Amino acid sequence: EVTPIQQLFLIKELKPGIARIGVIWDKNAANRDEVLPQLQRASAATGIKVVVAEVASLQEVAPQFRTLLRDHQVEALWVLEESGLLGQAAARSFLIKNATQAGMPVFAPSETWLKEGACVTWRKDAEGIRLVVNKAVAEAMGITIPAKYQDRTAFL
């Protein structure tokens, strides 16, 4: 319900100064033909370069993440859905740990990721977007809440 472009505009204010973000995308998720060109449009609109790494199985997760980090020097990890591989505990743990140990916040699709170390997720209420924040990690990662959302933010 929060679209990719709305998400990347939020990310731009949550981690101000970010120039490059990495997306881990599950080759078996639905809607690739929608989502993936929307990410490149979001990139041009927001000023943040988006690099997409596609994965089908757990053995593709680690090599793909290292390419985002060494070939592209991304500054955050952004996961857009968790229907399949990215809803598995092993993939989730691996991505959060390696992101955090590279100094990158994780923008995540559900509170399950927050319970395991990711920084921010979001929902759409009748009054618009609401943020859910892992207080402990978000304070350490220097995440900042845009003024419009100061009153629309819950801590985990």
Domain assignments of the chain as residue spans, ordered by start: 4-111
Contact partners, residue 115, CB within 8 Å, separation at least 6: 156
Residue 55 phi, psi (nearest 5) = -140, 145
What CA dihedral angle connects 94, 53, 31 and 112, to 10 degrees?
A: 20
Q: Is domain 4-111 in CATH 3.40.50.2300, yes or no?
A: yes
CA angle 15, 133, 36 (to 5 degrees): 60
Method used for this model?
Answer: X-ray
Residue 126 phi, psi (nearest 5) = -65, -30
Residue entry with tokens 């990215």: 86
